[PDB]
Amino acid sequence: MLEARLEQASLLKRVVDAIKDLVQDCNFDCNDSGIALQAMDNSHVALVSMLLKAEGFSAYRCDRNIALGINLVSLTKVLRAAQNEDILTLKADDSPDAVNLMFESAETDRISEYDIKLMDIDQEHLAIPETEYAATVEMPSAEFQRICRDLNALSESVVIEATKEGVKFSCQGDIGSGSVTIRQHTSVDKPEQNVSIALSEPVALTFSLKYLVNFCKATSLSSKVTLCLSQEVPLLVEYGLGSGHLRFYLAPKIG
Amino acid sequence: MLEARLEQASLLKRVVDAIKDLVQDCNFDCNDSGIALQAMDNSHVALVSMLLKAEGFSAYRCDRNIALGINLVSLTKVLRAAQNEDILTLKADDSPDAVNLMFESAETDRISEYDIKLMDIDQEHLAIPETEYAATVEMPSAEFQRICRDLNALSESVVIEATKEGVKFSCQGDIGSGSVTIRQHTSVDKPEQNVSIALSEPVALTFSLKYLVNFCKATSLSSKVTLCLSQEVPLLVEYGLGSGHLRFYLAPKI
Amino acid sequence: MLEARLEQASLLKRVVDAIKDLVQDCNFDCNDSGIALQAMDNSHVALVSMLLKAEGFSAYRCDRNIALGINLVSLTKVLRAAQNEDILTLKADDSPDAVNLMFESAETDRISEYDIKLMDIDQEHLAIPETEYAATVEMPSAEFQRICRDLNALSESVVIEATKEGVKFSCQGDIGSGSVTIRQHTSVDKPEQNSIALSEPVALTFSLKYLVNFCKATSLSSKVTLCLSQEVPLLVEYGLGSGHLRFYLAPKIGD
Amino acid sequence: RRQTSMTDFYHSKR
Amino acid sequence: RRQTSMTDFYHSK
Amino acid sequence: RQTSMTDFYHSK
């Protein structure tokens, strides 16, 4: 039934690395559109939504929808044996008990093959309607990661404030208080340094910094990150994949 | 009151990293001359004396002398948030309860601001008279650091022996005994890597290796270190800063 | 009695690093042929046999045979104080209580001297006859190390199975089953070569933790040789230039 | 005072 | 099922 | 024995 091939294995490895520390056991839902994933963490504070579209694969074939329950720690152990360059192929049969992974290297004749046992996972999926966000901030992913780490050194919580001016991340803790302010910045030379802010109405929300630091482990998937905020819904942190996407949703702190 | 601007935030980061493991809570005494520091460890075995001269800041202003009591671990947590090249600004008010740190980068217009709460530190300062040392050794800081780590792997104490020929560091321990001998070495090609000995009379002293290893965390501040020895005075280990200095004093074992 | 001078301190450091996690306390037997070592691990499952030939020293002199009993952890502590390019000199007398180490550097005039106390070790040496192996595989040491780590993440045991076409490493475990197949590959390349000399096919099972310990000798040579036959332990050999470092691994039987 | 849950905002689906 | 020993194959010398 | 810094310099 299922045969899904990546030209570069890196895409899968980073994706797994960007998910496994937030949620360990996930169902990869496979259909004609591709391979999707949605999972909440054990505390139900964050939600991961991944889509790897059939467009990104050499050869996508799936006549029957199937949920592949995978422990991502085991998957990471197996994926460590594949280089970023390796040609990767997932295969699965009709009512599968395991997923077959094949890594092929060039100029070597070396072939690696693994049969990873699947597991039964009861994953609570949520319906997320399309939202028109009050604020959308596109910024360098490494910059957001640096800000998150820096403020996490000082506090458990961060206030994100989006106004026409710019975006302010602020925190308070025993050591004192800190803040990082970014203004929308356009570079003629190098546009990965760009910060764009599309804002219909100002918005201010508080979030857990450890969850954001976990989110930022997807930095290797894209040089750009998009933060979508509005007052009454969880924060959206989106990384584009080229042909798919990885989204993290974070419920706010209120009191 | 106080507004002091550093060109590379790196200098302050190196200094704090070079002090924090010997003394955690320090008073930064700020006056027209600049920012100074003197502190003993809790055992009163070692003494740190830092001076950052006002000339080294790209705008130094201090209207009234003030001691900023800072926990250097918290300060390190805050200072990691600045790259070595960030433009750094310290500020403080009249009866300050906190120190304001501001990090600025070019081509971004990104602003980082932190307000670190100050703490009350009761400063016991010691009078250090100018001394004419029996021996003065100029050597690569990295070489001294390697020697200290190597001998610390085997022993808690090191004997330092300065003669006209050279300097011997020796130690003994359960595994056995070790020693490193350096001679006066002058290269025209790479003089970062020179060894100078100015000696009026030979000198032999014993010191704690853990304290010297702590001292050597200042290696990043200068490729060069100076060791000053005489029998009746503590050892002086000095790192030049360009616009100031960082000195460590170590009482001997007798 | 004993004075042995190495031009590069690196050789001894790497060699000790490749042994200490397998056997901690070793006798260095010094004679006119050079410095040899043979030691079994505490479980008697693996055996290390090192020879540093007298030819590899810039001055080797041994008036009387001597067994230098050395704790390799202490030896590593002392050898860390020498850079890879330091001129190293070992000295010992007739009835020694310690070994004298001298490190000298060029363009510096700094001399380091250490006297490591010896210890009394009763090491059981085994007679290993010259063997004609059913299969001899020459392959890049880094590749073998990577394979060993990858499979050790997944299993306790590995089946090494050699045929005329190529060599298969396979494993089984709770996560599933895996395999890496290398084919005989002759490119001018350099250390990418992979050669199999085989009289009869052979398949044996071995402990992966011991092989991972073996692979700590990777820094000694870009090439590793695996020698297999059905009735004797596996031989994993790293050439030294000066002699050799061999590891022997007894197989697992009756799976 | 309260860390909200994702299920506070979005309903369960199949 | 059984990890053999080096001493199963080579005798002491 | 390990001496103290206050044995060499007075407090001021």
Numbering used by the authors:
A (entry chain C): 1 to 255
B (entry chain B): 1 to 254
C (entry chain A): 1 to 194, 196 to 256
D (entry chain F): 142 to 155
E (entry chain D): 142 to 154
F (entry chain E): 143 to 154
Can you list sentences taken from the study reporting this PDB entry?
The DNA replication process is a desirable target for an antifungal product; hence, A. fumigatus proliferating cell nuclear antigen (afumPCNA) has been hypothesised as a fungal target for the development of new antifungals. The PCNA processivity factor is also known as the sliding clamp, as DNA slides through its central cavity. PCNA functions as a docking platform to allow DNA polymerases and a host of DNA replication and repair machinery to interact at the replication fork. The PCNA homotrimer comprises two domains, with each containing two alpha helices and nine beta strands, connected by a motif known as the interdomain connecting loop (IDCL), which forms part of the PCNA surface with which binding domain proteins interact.
The p21-derived peptide (139–160) was previously shown to bind to afumPCNA via fluorescence polarization with a KD of 3.1 µM. Previously, a shorter scaffold of this 22 amino acid p21 peptide was derived and synthesized: p21µ (141–155). It is 14 amino acids long, and it retained high-affinity binding, which was used to construct a library with variations relative to PIP-box residues as a rational starting point for the investigation of the fungal binding site. The co-crystal structure of afumPCNA bound to the p21µ peptide supports the hypothesis that A. fumigatus adopts a PIP-box sequence as a method for proteins to interact with afumPCNA. Here, we present an investigation of extensive structure–activity relationships between designed p21-based peptides and afumPCNA and the first crystal structure of a p21 peptide bound to afumPCNA, demonstrating that the A. fumigatus replication model uses a PIP-box sequence as the method for binding to afumPCNA. Differences in the protein sequence of afumPCNA and hPCNA account for the shift in affinity with the conservation of the secondary structure of the peptide. There is structural conservation around the 310 helical secondary structure and PIP-box, with more variability on the N- and C-terminus likely due to the mobility of the ends of the peptide and changes in IDCL residues. This has the effect of pushing the C-terminus to be quite distant from the protein’s surface while not forming the hydrogen bonds of the β-sheet as observed in the human structure. There is also the loss of 3.4 Å hydrogen bond interactions between hPCNA Gln131 and the Tyr151 phenol of p21µ in afumPCNA as this residue is Thr131.
